[PDB]
Amino acid sequence: ENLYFQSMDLDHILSLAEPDMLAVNQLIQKQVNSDVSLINQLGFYIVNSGGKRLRPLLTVLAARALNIQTEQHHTLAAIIEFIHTATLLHDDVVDTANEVFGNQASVLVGDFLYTRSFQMMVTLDSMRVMQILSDATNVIAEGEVLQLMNCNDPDTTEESYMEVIYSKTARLFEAATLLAGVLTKQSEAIENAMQDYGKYLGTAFQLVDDIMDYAGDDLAEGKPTLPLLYAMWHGNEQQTAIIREAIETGNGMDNLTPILETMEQTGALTYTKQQALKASQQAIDALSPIEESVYKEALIGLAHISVERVA
Amino acid sequence: ENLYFQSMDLDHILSLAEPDMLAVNQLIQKQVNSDVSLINQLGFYIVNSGGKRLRPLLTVLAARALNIQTEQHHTLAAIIEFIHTATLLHDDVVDTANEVFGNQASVLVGDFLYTRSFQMMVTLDSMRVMQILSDATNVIAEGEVLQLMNCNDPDTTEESYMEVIYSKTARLFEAATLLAGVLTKQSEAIENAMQDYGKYLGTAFQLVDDIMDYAGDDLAEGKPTLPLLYAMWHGNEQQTAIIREAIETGNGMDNLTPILETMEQTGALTYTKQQALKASQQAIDALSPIEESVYKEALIGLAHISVERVA
Ligand SMILES: O=C(O)CCCC(=O)O
Ligand SMILES: O=C(O)CCCC(=O)O
């Protein structure tokens, strides 16, 4: 009887969003602009298709699900993607544009994007927007530093890993969806609903990323992600010691297959997949208060799509 | 007859400002804080005496010259110094905390300070403050990129050099003094007066810095500053070619004394000193509309002090 039993697939999501996404991409091009040639060249290299990405998609779908009557979500989407791009540039120094243009330029163009995003925020003329994004971006910075601290630390806890995911990835998604609610003057209940959707969706996406690494860039650098940690926690004495050493010394690739084996035997990747599935469902469940629309259906489909590669 | 004929000296300026400056330094300590250990350690290393510096001094003197009735200038001073410190950290990558803690951490803690400064701005509850500082910080980023472009470029013009000084140094001073006017709800005329004071003061300070380099860190890196450029422009054919090559190749120290000689013969350092003197006087002249007070006298003394080492 239910003709719309299937969740919305990616092609339909992307077709639905396309007019908004192309408008975001155009705004990003016009906003990347400065008189300074190097900014324009590095900018082109890193953000020429910036409006055609996941965080802008989320943002425009959220705003349309909330019946936005302006084009302020195009500005918001560009802000969010500039924050993401600035973060990426800076993270690749501390670990690409920095390989191509140097650490220095990548840092400074990161700052150019970052500061420009705040200038765009000011055009929205909302102190609440500034509060939300200044809080979010400070959290991101803290999360990136916490991540850098955890590197080579085999005593990293599950809670600390999850705090890194939350701060460095999920918080920006959470802000984007909350801000769609702010711009459209929604109730506290609806704002909370959208905030939770973003937070959990972003969590799902990062968990899946960490799974797909092993399904070993992280291994190489001594990065303690959940699959590697969980394998260490549940492995036999020799397995645990191999992984501890890999984390401390970065020599994991010399024991690549034994480590991958430990992950299989302990169900470490499975456990991480379970956490991703949970986040995805929590995101979907958060949208209960939201009015039905094709944009709501797209947000639900995105949550399904986030964990598709993992089932 | 005039018992106060002498401009206020540095000891009197610093004594007058000390209660405010110690309050700024305390706020900076409390605001540097996070749960993340590395932020607290790098933070301590770079900003533990941040409230005892030139930009906070300027800011608190400006606000008191405008009869501020709150302590919002302590927040402003901390914001300005966080912006400066974040910039410095980032600039030292692209060229110290990065030598000590690594490029990566220095970049990210820079971002922590930067984003925290915006969170502090939000506490001032003024959209105009956010507009001014988002504009200023984007200008700084652009200026830092323009500087990086000019490096090793012997065709850099005087106008381009001055644009770098204006964007990378003077604009932040200009914002600080303008913002003292914004916080104390001054007229447009008084705001303009304070803005100009900061702009010209910051210009003076940077010119003096560039003079004092030669009075050869810049030489080493192919940096085209006014003294080196002017020497090239006015030197004989052999002198000009030596300096052109030094800029392009960074081999200037192999011709250290001939270059220094060219600067002497051409009056290149003198010409730059003349520009610094001019900026200093323009700053003093901008304060004409400001009500008399000991804080006004301190601002005037600071402008004199800026160029003292050069006369
Ligand atoms: O509701 C707020 O104003 C706080 C925003 C923090 C966030 O959830 O992203
Ligand atoms: O007056 C304004 O609102 C613009 C501030 C730019 C500046 O002079 O620093």
XYZ file of C-alpha atoms and ligand atoms in Angstrom:
640
model
C 0.000 0.000 0.000
C 2.770 2.569 0.965
C 4.140 3.702 -2.437
C 6.943 5.706 -0.760
C 8.217 2.857 1.411
C 11.791 3.179 0.073
C 14.037 5.886 1.521
C 15.147 8.553 -0.961
C 18.241 7.542 -2.892
C 21.291 9.659 -3.579
C 20.351 10.539 -7.205
C 16.999 11.888 -6.086
C 18.576 13.748 -3.185
C 21.172 15.338 -5.453
C 18.559 16.218 -8.133
C 16.290 17.790 -5.539
C 19.142 19.865 -4.083
C 20.872 20.769 -7.320
C 19.498 24.259 -7.904
C 20.488 25.276 -4.322
C 23.887 23.576 -4.528
C 24.782 25.331 -7.820
C 23.780 28.630 -6.244
C 26.043 27.876 -3.257
C 28.908 27.010 -5.567
C 28.510 30.290 -7.425
C 28.484 32.219 -4.152
C 31.609 30.399 -3.027
C 33.366 31.422 -6.282
C 32.363 35.071 -5.848
C 33.346 34.995 -2.172
C 36.673 33.264 -2.629
C 37.683 36.437 -4.336
C 40.362 38.929 -3.304
C 42.898 41.147 -5.093
C 45.676 38.795 -3.996
C 46.595 36.373 -6.815
C 47.907 33.532 -4.609
C 44.640 33.483 -2.633
C 42.754 33.148 -5.895
C 44.989 30.289 -7.146
C 45.140 28.235 -3.956
C 41.433 29.098 -3.502
C 40.535 27.755 -6.940
C 42.541 24.600 -6.267
C 40.766 23.832 -2.994
C 37.266 25.337 -3.218
C 36.231 25.719 -6.875
C 33.564 23.006 -6.423
C 33.053 23.725 -2.697
C 29.302 24.219 -3.089
C 28.940 20.692 -4.538
C 29.926 18.953 -1.242
C 28.350 17.115 1.680
C 28.188 19.932 4.249
C 26.527 22.406 1.896
C 24.089 19.607 0.867
C 23.162 19.037 4.495
C 22.749 22.704 5.091
C 20.511 23.466 2.128
C 18.340 20.347 2.684
C 17.906 21.331 6.342
C 16.894 24.872 5.516
C 14.401 23.773 2.835
C 12.965 21.127 5.248
C 12.256 24.120 7.489
C 10.544 26.095 4.693
C 13.144 28.846 4.404
C 11.730 31.899 2.570
C 15.054 33.657 1.851
C 18.369 32.627 0.244
C 20.235 32.960 3.561
C 20.907 29.216 3.540
C 23.172 29.681 0.525
C 25.314 32.029 2.659
C 25.167 29.583 5.553
C 26.217 26.695 3.358
C 29.196 28.654 2.073
C 30.149 29.622 5.656
C 30.076 25.994 6.762
C 32.122 24.790 3.854
C 34.712 27.588 4.343
C 35.108 26.492 7.963
C 35.543 22.897 6.861
C 38.043 23.796 4.110
C 40.064 26.076 6.479
C 40.222 23.235 9.015
C 41.362 20.731 6.406
C 44.125 23.016 5.187
C 45.353 23.543 8.727
C 45.133 19.857 9.604
C 47.243 18.898 6.599
C 50.078 21.089 7.821
C 50.084 19.409 11.236
C 50.011 15.914 9.619
C 47.153 18.372 -0.692
C 47.373 22.173 -0.957
C 50.323 22.360 1.506
C 52.344 19.788 -0.513
C 51.528 21.851 -3.620
C 51.639 25.436 -2.268
C 53.635 24.933 0.953
C 52.649 24.862 4.578
C 52.808 28.637 4.781
C 50.304 29.526 2.088
C 47.932 26.737 3.059
C 47.938 28.092 6.618
C 47.333 31.667 5.512
C 44.687 30.926 2.876
C 43.038 28.811 5.572
C 42.962 31.965 7.644
C 41.619 33.918 4.647
C 38.721 31.424 4.322
C 38.159 31.350 8.028
C 37.981 35.082 8.416
C 35.894 35.474 5.289
C 33.410 32.988 6.763
C 33.015 35.294 9.764
C 32.499 38.299 7.474
C 29.732 36.280 5.765
C 28.217 35.457 9.172
C 28.010 39.168 9.891
C 25.851 39.634 6.776
C 23.237 37.330 8.395
C 22.903 39.987 11.105
C 22.365 37.553 13.978
C 24.296 37.483 17.236
C 23.008 33.922 17.854
C 24.613 32.775 14.584
C 27.954 34.266 15.691
C 27.634 32.656 19.127
C 26.928 29.231 17.644
C 29.735 29.322 15.108
C 32.357 30.924 17.372
C 31.589 28.154 19.922
C 31.685 25.482 17.221
C 34.902 26.594 15.662
C 36.656 26.831 19.034
C 35.486 23.266 19.756
C 36.900 22.139 16.419
C 40.272 23.698 17.273
C 40.271 21.965 20.638
C 39.344 18.657 19.008
C 42.146 18.966 16.508
C 44.609 19.550 19.324
C 43.193 16.623 21.320
C 43.628 14.436 18.220
C 47.238 15.537 17.824
C 47.783 14.673 21.530
C 46.265 11.204 21.149
C 48.592 10.336 18.282
C 51.042 7.683 19.434
C 49.180 7.349 22.750
C 48.132 3.695 23.188
C 46.285 4.513 26.407
C 43.702 6.627 24.523
C 40.250 5.700 25.840
C 37.045 5.094 23.869
C 35.568 8.221 25.467
C 38.563 10.307 24.267
C 38.281 8.896 20.737
C 34.576 9.745 20.711
C 35.285 13.256 22.008
C 37.672 13.785 19.062
C 34.966 12.657 16.591
C 32.412 14.831 18.245
C 34.608 17.977 18.295
C 36.531 17.694 15.033
C 33.680 16.388 12.806
C 30.226 16.154 14.338
C 30.081 19.627 15.877
C 30.235 21.402 12.506
C 27.360 19.248 11.138
C 25.437 19.955 14.324
C 25.947 23.683 13.944
C 24.878 23.653 10.286
C 21.519 21.979 10.982
C 20.858 23.983 14.167
C 21.544 27.129 12.151
C 18.955 26.195 9.552
C 16.533 26.256 12.510
C 17.876 29.591 13.746
C 17.578 31.241 10.327
C 13.962 30.075 9.912
C 13.011 31.131 13.472
C 12.001 27.706 14.709
C 11.008 26.695 18.211
C 13.442 25.373 20.742
C 12.058 21.875 20.218
C 12.638 21.994 16.445
C 16.086 23.567 16.932
C 16.984 20.741 19.304
C 15.712 18.195 16.810
C 17.837 19.626 13.979
C 20.899 20.005 16.208
C 20.722 16.364 17.229
C 20.217 15.258 13.635
C 23.429 16.993 12.580
C 25.434 15.814 15.558
C 24.536 12.174 15.069
C 24.857 12.299 11.283
C 28.333 13.776 11.542
C 29.240 11.103 14.096
C 28.081 8.365 11.681
C 30.105 9.787 8.841
C 33.329 9.977 10.865
C 32.914 6.427 12.226
C 32.453 5.169 8.701
C 35.567 7.027 7.575
C 37.569 5.376 10.361
C 36.183 1.940 9.384
C 36.943 2.426 5.709
C 40.606 3.158 6.502
C 41.023 -0.502 7.413
C 38.347 -2.103 5.202
C 46.063 1.727 6.767
C 46.807 5.468 6.626
C 45.965 5.854 10.317
C 48.050 2.801 11.197
C 51.100 4.372 9.537
C 50.944 7.523 11.755
C 50.272 5.911 15.166
C 46.653 7.191 15.146
C 44.520 5.459 17.758
C 41.102 5.054 16.098
C 38.370 2.801 17.473
C 39.032 -0.237 15.283
C 42.715 -0.323 16.210
C 42.089 0.442 19.906
C 39.345 -2.139 20.263
C 41.529 -4.795 18.640
C 44.259 -4.004 21.174
C 41.823 -4.083 24.082
C 40.410 -7.501 23.131
C 43.394 -9.216 21.501
C 45.616 -11.893 23.036
C 48.796 -10.845 24.846
C 50.956 -10.910 21.695
C 48.321 -9.129 19.572
C 47.855 -6.385 22.179
C 51.613 -5.798 22.431
C 52.013 -5.594 18.655
C 49.289 -2.923 18.437
C 50.535 -0.986 21.495
C 53.960 -0.867 19.848
C 52.430 0.121 16.500
C 50.664 3.035 18.143
C 53.780 4.197 20.024
C 56.295 3.737 17.204
C 54.377 3.942 13.932
C 55.776 0.540 12.803
C 52.346 -1.079 12.304
C 52.823 -1.766 8.600
C 55.593 -4.259 9.487
C 52.787 -6.206 11.198
C 50.000 -5.241 8.794
C 48.387 -8.686 8.376
C 48.668 -9.741 12.043
C 46.990 -6.470 13.074
C 44.246 -6.853 10.462
C 43.804 -10.399 11.756
C 43.434 -9.207 15.347
C 40.771 -6.754 14.178
C 38.891 -9.606 12.486
C 39.194 -12.009 15.436
C 38.151 -9.420 18.014
C 35.248 -8.016 15.963
C 36.814 -4.559 16.222
C 35.615 -3.328 12.840
C 32.203 -4.859 13.547
C 31.956 -3.040 16.857
C 32.813 0.242 15.136
C 30.227 -0.474 12.419
C 27.675 -1.017 15.181
C 28.427 2.414 16.607
C 28.024 3.974 13.145
C 24.676 2.236 12.649
C 23.572 3.558 16.017
C 24.515 7.161 15.193
C 22.715 6.922 11.844
C 19.496 5.726 13.489
C 19.774 8.355 16.243
C 19.971 11.010 13.519
C 16.846 9.668 11.800
C 15.004 9.446 15.118
C 15.880 13.070 15.922
C 13.825 14.227 12.923
C 10.493 12.973 14.393
C 9.245 16.472 15.234
C 9.989 17.783 11.724
C 7.113 18.398 9.286
C 6.896 15.925 6.343
C 8.435 17.074 3.045
C 10.652 15.769 0.291
C 13.537 17.590 2.063
C 12.849 15.704 5.291
C 12.902 12.498 3.238
C 16.235 13.547 1.744
C 17.705 14.155 5.236
C 16.543 10.668 6.232
C 18.037 9.177 3.070
C 21.356 10.890 3.768
C 21.457 9.244 7.191
C 20.895 5.848 5.533
C 23.479 6.573 2.872
C 26.066 7.513 5.502
C 26.329 3.893 6.668
C 25.528 2.053 3.402
C 29.148 1.085 2.701
C 29.361 -0.574 6.104
C 26.399 -2.992 6.099
C 54.911 78.883 31.946
C 53.555 75.488 30.587
C 54.520 72.993 33.340
C 53.363 70.028 31.205
C 55.380 70.957 28.119
C 57.107 67.542 27.982
C 55.233 64.618 26.430
C 54.468 61.750 28.817
C 57.329 59.287 29.091
C 57.109 55.519 28.991
C 57.420 55.005 32.791
C 54.495 57.318 33.419
C 52.473 55.718 30.642
C 53.121 52.236 32.007
C 52.375 53.316 35.622
C 49.132 54.960 34.560
C 48.024 51.868 32.620
C 49.260 49.233 35.032
C 46.053 48.415 36.890
C 44.216 47.892 33.544
C 47.092 45.931 32.004
C 47.307 43.528 34.988
C 43.562 42.999 34.732
C 43.939 42.213 31.010
C 46.736 39.776 31.746
C 44.601 37.973 34.308
C 41.719 37.741 31.844
C 44.059 36.372 29.199
C 45.215 33.650 31.643
C 41.630 32.678 32.486
C 40.653 32.750 28.807
C 43.624 30.807 27.514
C 42.097 27.936 29.363
C 40.741 24.672 27.963
C 40.659 21.022 29.070
C 43.305 20.209 26.464
C 46.782 20.066 28.061
C 48.794 20.968 24.930
C 46.717 24.135 24.440
C 47.498 25.115 28.010
C 51.260 24.475 27.593
C 51.761 26.149 24.222
C 49.350 28.855 25.469
C 51.436 29.505 28.577
C 54.592 29.648 26.468
C 53.211 32.258 24.073
C 50.622 34.304 25.990
C 51.318 34.121 29.742
C 52.279 37.829 29.765
C 50.015 38.728 26.810
C 48.222 41.470 28.744
C 51.545 43.270 29.370
C 52.088 44.116 25.648
C 51.807 47.038 23.243
C 48.414 46.295 21.663
C 46.619 45.838 24.978
C 48.325 49.063 26.210
C 46.989 50.953 23.212
C 43.568 49.523 23.681
C 43.184 50.291 27.375
C 44.642 53.826 27.017
C 42.218 54.509 24.153
C 39.213 53.313 26.097
C 40.146 55.322 29.212
C 40.787 58.432 27.021
C 37.153 57.973 25.987
C 35.922 57.714 29.602
C 34.839 54.079 29.469
C 32.465 53.236 32.356
C 32.665 49.421 32.095
C 35.505 46.861 31.990
C 34.695 45.911 28.380
C 38.061 47.299 27.277
C 39.792 44.503 29.181
C 37.901 42.008 26.976
C 38.718 44.064 23.897
C 42.388 44.198 24.778
C 42.503 40.434 25.203
C 40.691 39.967 21.859
C 43.213 42.165 20.072
C 46.186 40.441 21.583
C 44.754 36.967 20.773
C 44.398 38.040 17.141
C 47.969 39.298 17.129
C 49.335 36.144 18.804
C 47.358 33.837 16.423
C 48.766 35.765 13.452
C 52.320 35.531 14.755
C 52.051 31.790 15.280
C 50.733 31.316 11.765
C 53.332 33.614 10.226
C 56.168 31.688 11.856
C 55.049 28.495 10.156
C 55.094 30.145 6.727
C 58.574 31.652 7.396
C 59.424 30.366 18.265
C 56.491 28.148 19.285
C 56.581 26.187 15.977
C 60.320 25.398 16.393
C 59.506 24.286 19.954
C 56.071 22.641 19.527
C 56.041 21.997 15.759
C 54.272 23.675 12.900
C 51.151 21.628 13.521
C 50.447 22.610 17.106
C 51.387 26.236 16.534
C 48.878 26.340 13.670
C 46.121 24.727 15.712
C 46.679 26.687 18.929
C 46.685 29.761 16.690
C 43.244 28.658 15.596
C 42.261 28.062 19.240
C 43.252 31.669 20.096
C 41.628 33.018 16.998
C 38.330 31.314 17.576
C 38.378 32.112 21.271
C 38.826 35.786 20.364
C 35.588 35.599 18.373
C 33.801 33.938 21.303
C 34.997 36.873 23.449
C 33.715 39.328 20.820
C 30.294 37.734 21.111
C 30.246 38.556 24.840
C 30.435 42.275 23.896
C 27.047 41.790 22.221
C 27.702 44.155 19.315
C 27.274 43.349 15.640
C 29.433 46.401 14.779
C 32.320 44.928 16.800
C 32.029 41.656 14.843
C 31.875 43.543 11.539
C 34.986 45.565 12.354
C 37.060 42.627 13.532
C 35.929 40.154 10.853
C 36.893 42.810 8.248
C 40.192 43.502 10.005
C 41.209 39.919 10.386
C 40.411 39.124 6.748
C 42.581 42.106 5.749
C 45.399 40.764 7.908
C 45.166 37.373 6.181
C 45.271 39.045 2.786
C 48.252 41.155 3.845
C 50.130 38.116 5.044
C 49.556 36.429 1.702
C 50.600 39.574 -0.190
C 53.795 39.642 1.900
C 54.527 36.008 1.088
C 54.007 36.857 -2.624
C 56.389 39.823 -2.484
C 59.184 37.703 -1.041
C 61.921 37.328 -3.637
C 60.131 39.794 -5.937
C 62.535 42.656 -6.752
C 59.841 44.489 -8.707
C 57.779 45.083 -5.532
C 56.608 48.708 -5.563
C 56.564 51.211 -2.688
C 52.757 51.166 -2.816
C 52.741 47.342 -2.444
C 55.171 47.499 0.488
C 52.961 50.101 2.159
C 49.854 47.990 1.530
C 51.555 45.076 3.338
C 52.341 47.323 6.342
C 48.854 48.674 6.370
C 47.148 45.243 6.183
C 49.450 43.061 8.269
C 50.228 45.576 11.074
C 48.401 48.892 11.011
C 44.879 47.558 10.491
C 44.804 45.737 13.841
C 45.934 48.909 15.695
C 43.311 50.854 13.773
C 40.602 48.409 14.764
C 41.623 48.467 18.435
C 41.349 52.261 18.751
C 38.178 52.493 16.631
C 36.660 49.831 18.879
C 37.387 51.852 21.996
C 35.181 54.491 20.325
C 32.503 51.935 19.460
C 32.363 50.541 23.001
C 32.002 54.028 24.522
C 29.345 55.077 21.966
C 31.264 57.972 20.476
C 30.314 60.115 17.515
C 31.408 59.379 14.003
C 33.924 62.217 14.211
C 35.545 60.814 17.372
C 35.475 57.269 15.946
C 37.240 58.542 12.832
C 39.791 60.342 14.971
C 40.596 57.201 16.987
C 40.668 54.994 13.886
C 43.190 57.266 12.213
C 45.304 57.433 15.359
C 45.609 53.647 15.436
C 46.235 53.291 11.726
C 49.054 55.811 11.681
C 50.568 54.614 14.957
C 50.678 51.045 13.699
C 52.248 52.273 10.457
C 54.973 54.097 12.436
C 55.749 51.042 14.498
C 56.122 48.753 11.473
C 58.339 51.252 9.610
C 60.569 51.478 12.643
C 60.760 47.692 12.850
C 61.848 47.539 9.205
C 64.489 50.242 9.832
C 65.844 48.523 12.919
C 66.434 45.309 10.943
C 69.261 47.077 9.130
C 70.347 49.606 11.783
C 69.749 41.623 8.238
C 67.031 39.033 8.928
C 64.919 40.371 6.059
C 67.943 40.443 3.758
C 68.554 36.736 4.399
C 65.026 35.734 3.206
C 64.739 37.906 0.062
C 62.207 40.215 1.793
C 61.731 43.468 -0.094
C 61.312 46.113 2.634
C 61.505 49.847 1.965
C 65.136 50.380 2.961
C 66.356 47.606 0.669
C 64.019 48.569 -2.202
C 64.876 52.251 -2.034
C 68.596 51.462 -2.053
C 68.072 49.384 -5.201
C 65.996 52.096 -6.854
C 68.602 54.818 -6.234
C 71.878 52.881 -6.347
C 74.391 52.794 -9.198
C 74.125 50.047 -11.819
C 76.301 47.582 -9.874
C 74.586 48.339 -6.541
C 71.113 47.893 -8.053
C 72.074 44.552 -9.617
C 73.553 43.253 -6.364
C 70.321 44.056 -4.489
C 68.039 42.724 -7.259
C 69.994 39.466 -7.108
C 69.867 39.446 -3.299
C 66.098 39.760 -3.403
C 65.683 37.022 -6.035
C 68.201 34.546 -4.615
C 68.529 35.269 -0.901
C 72.346 35.627 -1.222
C 72.466 39.177 0.198
C 74.681 38.294 3.152
C 77.522 37.513 0.705
C 77.301 41.226 -0.164
C 76.306 42.468 3.292
C 78.642 45.491 3.508
C 78.187 46.647 -0.111
C 74.401 46.565 0.379
C 74.614 48.424 3.694
C 76.844 50.927 1.904
C 74.302 51.433 -0.877
C 71.648 52.083 1.771
C 73.888 54.725 3.363
C 74.831 56.401 0.065
C 71.261 56.504 -1.229
C 69.718 57.693 2.059
C 67.414 54.667 2.005
C 67.236 54.239 5.770
C 66.818 58.005 6.129
C 63.920 58.021 3.693
C 62.246 55.215 5.641
C 62.840 57.094 8.913
C 61.155 60.109 7.330
C 58.080 58.034 6.550
C 57.989 56.762 10.149
C 58.239 60.307 11.506
C 55.376 61.299 9.242
C 53.122 58.461 10.431
C 53.893 59.300 14.066
C 52.910 62.948 13.590
C 49.780 61.984 11.629
C 48.745 59.818 14.587
C 49.241 62.694 17.037
C 47.365 65.084 14.753
C 44.427 62.664 14.523
C 43.807 63.068 18.266
C 42.895 66.798 17.977
C 39.171 66.199 18.518
C 39.776 64.102 21.654
C 39.045 65.591 25.094
C 42.147 66.382 27.235
C 43.127 63.762 29.832
C 46.192 61.986 31.117
C 45.183 59.070 28.824
C 45.185 61.356 25.786
C 48.651 62.509 26.860
C 49.744 58.878 27.123
C 48.476 58.152 23.574
C 50.478 61.149 22.345
C 53.559 59.970 24.234
C 53.238 56.508 22.702
C 53.292 58.064 19.237
C 56.507 59.912 20.156
C 58.015 56.799 21.680
C 57.271 54.784 18.536
C 59.902 56.716 16.566
C 62.369 57.584 19.368
C 64.927 54.947 18.350
C 65.044 56.413 14.855
C 65.821 60.106 15.468
O 21.964 26.918 21.166
C 22.981 27.634 21.165
O 22.886 28.883 20.988
C 24.340 26.941 21.372
C 24.918 26.346 20.078
C 25.907 25.178 20.220
C 25.604 24.023 19.235
O 24.782 23.184 19.572
O 26.149 23.849 18.117
O 33.470 51.659 10.634
C 33.298 50.450 10.400
O 32.301 49.838 10.881
C 34.346 49.739 9.524
C 35.581 49.277 10.314
C 36.892 49.102 9.531
C 38.104 49.726 10.263
O 38.326 50.916 10.093
O 38.911 49.112 11.006
